């Protein structure tokens, strides 16, 4: 059971400044390669911040 994988998915689901398109891309990324979930979440969090109102 992969906690980091499940956790990246959850936090990405709830990030408020991502488009639906971006949200979807990151969740597809997580499916394609779970072993880089840490880095996918960091990229997501970093894009979500740069897209602050």
């Amino acid at each position: 059971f992969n906690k980091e994988w499940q956790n990246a998915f959850y936090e990405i689901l709830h990030l408020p400044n991502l488009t639906e398109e971006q949200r979807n891309g990151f969740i597809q990324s997580l499916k394609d390669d779970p072993s880089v979930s840490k880095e996918i979440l960091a990229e997501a969090k970093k894009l979500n911040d740069a897209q602050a109102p």
Binding site: G25, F26, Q28, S29, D32, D33, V36, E39, I40, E43, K46, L47
Partner: protein, 207 residues
Amino acid sequence: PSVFLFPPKPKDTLMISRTPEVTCVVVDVSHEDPEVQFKWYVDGVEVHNAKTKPREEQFNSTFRVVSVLTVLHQDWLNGKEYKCKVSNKALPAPIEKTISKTKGQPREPQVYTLPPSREEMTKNQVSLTCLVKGFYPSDIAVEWESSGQPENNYNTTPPMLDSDGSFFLYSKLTVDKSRWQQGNIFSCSVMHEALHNHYTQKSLSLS
């Protein structure tokens, strides 16, 4: 008594001039029982062309045993799974590890060359840069040449995950400022599954 499975080098799976291979490395084999048996499978089916190397006694007198399986470029690229089953006296039950190419929609690298900064031109040696971005999966190879002759004094960063879920890297070729200033032509070539012919090459020179 433990097992590791390694993929082929990216350049090997991509160039027909090369021979790619999957490698099974067993460590901490007891000196009491150095016998190790390797069974290999490709998508469930057993193959027999694997080769075990001469074992290597470690400082603490344990052994390290390597099995190397040549594979078909096209089988790796199309996602076949390679399974290694490892057998030894010391093992409760045999050990299995499997490996296969990273899944996900492939994306073609964009390749840009960048000349030295002006501030860098005070030094004896300068820095030629190649940016490679937008590519997926991360499996990639990079070299430099100058009018067809290989360069060696370059360093290429590991791929890094970018903000759109593709990868990027930089490759830096160090050259004598003299060669740069007298207009010699440098070229970076990039090898990846999503490029036509699995390669492209981009040139850099003083204008």
